[PDB]
């Protein structure tokens, strides 16, 4: 992931790994819908059921309906590129994280 996401410092990615481990509650290397629900609540920005789904859908490049750490980094790639909507749960997740 350091090799691929060269637009991010090592400091940044590690902060994103920390966030990812923090909310991957089952500790199985993915963030599922339920996990993302709790995360957006913990961040103070709960999202609607369908909003959670599109969050995942937008960066779920392997269609497994879960988020891999690779797809978590896509959130931040997409956001830094200016590609997300602004009311969008993905943008909200990114701006509420502390990266
Ligand atoms: Zn998980
Ligand atoms: Zn549903
Ligand atoms: Zn996926």
Numbering used by the authors: 82 to 180
Paper text:
Although separately localized within cells, both are actin-binding proteins that modulate F-actin rearrangement through Ca2+-independent actin-binding and Ca2+-dependent actin-bundling activity. EFhd1Zn, EFhd2Zn and EFhd1Ca comprised two EF-hands, a ligand mimic (LM) helix at the C-terminus, a PR region at the N-terminus and a C-terminal linker.
To obtain EFhd2Zn, we added EGTA and EDTA to final molar concentrations 15 times higher (0.18 mM each) than that of the protein to the EFhd2 proteins to remove native ions and then dialyzed the proteins. Thereafter, ZnCl2 was added to the protein solution to a final concentration of 0.75 mM. At a wavelength near the Zn K-edge (λ = 1.2851 Å/9648 eV), the Ca2+ f″ and Zn2+ f″ were 0.9 and 0.5 electrons, respectively. For that reason, we cannot rule out the possibility that the anomalous signals for EFhd2Zn originated from Ca2+, because the wavelength for the EFhd2Zn data collection was near the Zn K-edge [Fig. 1(g)]. We used a single EFhd2Zn crystal to collect datasets at the peak and remote positions of the Zn K-edge, which are termed EFhd2Zn(P) or EFhd2Zn(R), respectively. The peak heights of the ΔAno map calculated from EFhd2Zn(P) and EFhd2Zn(R) were 11.1 and 9.3σ in EF1 and EF2, respectively [Figs.
